[PDB]
RNA sequence: UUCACAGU
RNA sequence: UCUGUGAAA
């Protein structure tokens, strides 16, 4: 439960493919950087000027330490250099003045490039993390002051309009990645919506449509004044009369010409003056457009008011405000390009890229290839998928994606007693309307083989969330074992969350809900993935994998865990779900209400032990083997999570019997990060987005230099360039091989439910994700109270209701 | 709240 | 969480 396991082998499974990936080769050499700490005081200003401080520093004291050498910096504490510096242990003391800061630095320690390569090689079995941190830092230092830092991406102006004032800005990311023989740097591109550095009264012929400000030769109406307002106030503006930068908390209700304020003059005495007066004297500028109102900058009742033809808007400022569907329409256009075109993107960005330029980055010795690198992938093998009925139709996926025609499920359900509660206005979502989506479903559902084989025996509508539980509780006695009530719903409101929470937690009573919209059209496709729902929810079983198909490990009992917890942006919501059957088809859920913003599953083994009591219920049998996929977990998290969790699966095994040690494979999964793969071959492209077949997998070249992980694109990718998901191992006492785990996770993203296609991650893991959701939504309405809102009925636990 | 994928 | 695309020829 400390080390992860090194890679057994490499996979030979599926076809080959040639592809290129967004990483980057990269030449490092095998000198010692030195790492010290920078304590600055004051040491609450903002990264920007921290770097600008170092620096200063630096050149600074140039001929009496730092002389030659270009150190880099992280932007808070840690400072790296290429040659040593005339230092001790001592922090020595500083004075920089930035036009007075204290600056306290102390040799921290020796970071070895050499132990490093040796980590890329067969010398060493682990990766030293500060080599790669150190490295990132120098790769970063100076992007850091030349673009403008969006989380770990930078971005820069184009060279793109969005109207409003704003425009659209690309960046990339960055980081450097350590794999096979040679270091990488991984580079993606992005796009964001930031402010223009325009004067603020083009600022306001755009936001007030104006194309020249001679269109508005009077004041501004309310209206237009209380627009502009909310569309400035907040952004920092910039003078050009001088320069300094304010930020705008209010704008004035009087134009330039009567606005005052209590000039101080140099008596000592206060005389009430306007803006204009005050500008036309002082400054000698008389403003060319006086009948426009005043910015109000500094803050409160200090009556700081500057005109709007001295400011623009200052540069390096995100739109966070939601935009306009024209605005965010051109937005979408930037920021998901289909696969060729990102791959363009990159490969035009690396091929005039800085690094190799970058006096930093030459300081250590780093040279960064331009071409994307070669690599061969895999496209594995797609399960059979096997149907019911009398047919018992086989569907093959083609391209990750399958169908029901002339297929009936595998175990339908036959629904004998149903009702429907509307609670969307009758005159809106008529009588008509329910009864064609009535006898429609209904025909989806018998060619499906879900038979409802009646009319619903309750049909009323209704509304108001209040209405939810005193109508399911008066359904649960009145119709003697209704098996489904369908729940049509106008819009968002909060009567879903309130079906959500009396169906599963208080009455446990399956509900289905519609949209009103696709009640009164409805779609052939729409009722059938809805059908896929009901089927789940009411025990059925749409399809199997193709039992001969499947890998050796279903030779003997195995469950397959599912993880995953989602955070507040207000409590961390974790779930757990585990297979309870052979196929693996059904799954049992656990879910636990914990610490805000805690990634570590803290009731762990109570959760495994009931999915292992639920699993030995279901099977009659103990696994000998337990699959755990864990979501949504950072590598900085890797040791902890591996560690306390790791240890919670095995306590819940030696907790259940004394010497039942069932092999466990911790998987994490990850569908967050920056790795791109694409077609080298254009006949190789799929559909429009031109993205890699699903079934793609990568566990070469661009993966961990000694440990167990591997890339797999079991998805289709519909829009934009897909995101192939993650797979890294963190233990495996089953001593898998890459091509049988391979197969398994991409089998097992053939096996999610609520559609015929294959899912960009496992369905344990999935589920997981949904189940957490549904939590989410039962929340709505203690820890322990909160412990209790998240527990479902009785009736709930067997099922799966987060279908 | 038919569904998946993709952006933030 | 929202937003978008997709289930013509």
């Not at 699903?694 to 961990?704: E, F, N, R, S, Y």
Request: proline fraction near 6%; charge should be positive; charged fraction near 20%.
């Amino acid at each position: 439960a400390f080390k992860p396991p090194p890679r057994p082998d490499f996979g030979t499974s599926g076809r080959t493919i040639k592809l290129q990936a967004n990483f980057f080769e990269m030449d490092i050499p095998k000198i010692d950087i030195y790492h010290y700490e920078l304590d600055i005081k004051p040491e609450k200003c903002p990264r920007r000027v921290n770097r600008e401080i170092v620096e200063h520093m630096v050149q600074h004291f140039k001929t009496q330490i730092f002389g030659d050498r270009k150190p880099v910096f992280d932007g808070r504490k840690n400072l790296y250099t290429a040659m040593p510096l005339p230092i001790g242990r001592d922090k020595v003391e500083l004075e920089v003045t930035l036009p007075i800061f204290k600056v306290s630095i102390k040799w921290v320690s020796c970071v070895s490039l050499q132990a490093l390569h040796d980590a890329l090689s067969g010398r060493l079995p682990s990766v030293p993390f500060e080599t790669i941190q150190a490295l990132d830092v120098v790769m970063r230092h100076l992007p850091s002051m030349r673009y403008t830092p969006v989380g770990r991406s930078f971005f820069t102006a184009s060279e793109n309009p969005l109207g409003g004032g704003r425009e659209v800005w690309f960046g990339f990311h960055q980081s450097v990645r350590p794999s096979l023989w040679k270091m990488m740097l991984n580079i993606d591109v992005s796009a964001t919506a930031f402010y223009k550095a325009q004067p603020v009264i083009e600022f306001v012929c755009e936001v007030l449509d104006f194309k020249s400000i001679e269109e508005q030769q009077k004041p501004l109406t309310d209206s237009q004044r209380v627009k502009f307002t909310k569309e400035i106030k907040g952004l920092k503006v910039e003078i050009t009369h001088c320069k300094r930068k304010y930020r705008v908390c209010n704008v004035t209700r009087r134009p330039a010409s009567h606005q005052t304020f209590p000039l101080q003059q140099e008596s000592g005495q206060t005389v009430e003056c306007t803006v204009a007066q005050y500008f036309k004297d002082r400054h000698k500028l008389v403003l060319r457009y006086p009948h426009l109102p005043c910015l109000q900058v500094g803050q409160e009742q200090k009556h700081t008011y500057l005109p709007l033809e001295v400011c623009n808007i200052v540069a390096g400022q995100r739109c966070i405000k939601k935009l306009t569907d024209n605005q965010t329409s051109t937005m979408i256009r930037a920021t998901a390009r289909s696969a060729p075109d990102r791959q363009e993107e990159i490969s035009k960005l690396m091929r005039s890229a800085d690094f190799n330029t970058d006096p930093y980055v030459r300081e250590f010795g780093i040279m960064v290839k331009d071409e994307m690198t070669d690599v061969t992938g895999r496209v594995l093998q797609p399960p059979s998928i096997l149907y019911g009925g009398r047919n018992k139709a086989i569907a093959t996926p083609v391209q990750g994606v399958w169908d029901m025609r002339n297929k009936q499920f595998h175990t339908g359900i036959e629904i004998k007693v149903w009702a429907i509660a509307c609670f969307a206005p009758q005159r809106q979502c008529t009588e008509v309307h329910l009864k064609s989506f009535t006898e429609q479903l209904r025909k989806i559902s018998r060619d499906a083989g879900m038979p409802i084989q009646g009319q619903p025996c309750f049909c009323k509508y209704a509304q108001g969330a209040d209405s939810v539980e005193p109508m399911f509780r008066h359904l649960k006695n009145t119709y003697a074992g209704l098996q489904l009530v369908v729940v049509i719903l106008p819009g968002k409101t909060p009567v879903y969350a309130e079906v959500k929470r009396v169906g599963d937690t208080v009455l446990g009573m399956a509900t289905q809900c519609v949209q009103m919209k696709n009640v009164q059209r409805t779609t052939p496709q729409t009722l059938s993935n809805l059908c896929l729902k009901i089927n789940v929810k009411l025990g059925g079983v749409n399809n199997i994998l193709l039992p001969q198909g499947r890998p050796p490990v279903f030779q003997q009992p195995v469950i397959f865990l599912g993880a995953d917890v989602t955070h507040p942006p207000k409590p961390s919501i974790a779930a757990v779900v585990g297979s309870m059957d052979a196929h693996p088809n059904r799954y049992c859920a656990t879910v636990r209400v914990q610490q805000h913003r805690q990634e570590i599953i803290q009731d762990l083994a109570a959760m495994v032990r009931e999915l292992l009591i639920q699993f030995y219920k279901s099977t009659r049998f103990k696994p000998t083997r337990i699959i755990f996929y864990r979501a949504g977990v950072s590598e900085g998290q890797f040791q902890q999570v591996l560690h306390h969790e790791l240890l919670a699966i095995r306590e819940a095994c030696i907790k259940l019997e004394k010497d039942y040690q069932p092999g466990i494979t911790f998987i994490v999964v990850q569908k967050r990060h920056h790795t791109r793969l694409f077609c080298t071959d254009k006949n190789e492209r799929v559909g429009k987005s031109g993205n890699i077949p699903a079934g793609t997998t990568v566990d070469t070249k661009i993966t961990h230099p000694t440990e167990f992980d591997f890339y797999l694109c079991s998805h289709a990718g519909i829009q934009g360039t897909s995101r192939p998901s993650h797979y890294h191992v963190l233990w495996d006492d089953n001593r898998f091989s890459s091509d049988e785990l391979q197969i398994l996770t991409y089998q097992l993203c053939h096996t999610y439910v609520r559609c015929t296609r294959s899912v960009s991650i496992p369905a344990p893991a999935y589920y997981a994700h949904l189940v957490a959701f549904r939590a989410r939504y039962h929340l709505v309405d203690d820890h322990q109270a909160l412990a209790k809102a998240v527990q479902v009925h009785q009736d709930t636990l067997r099922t799966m209701y987060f279908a």
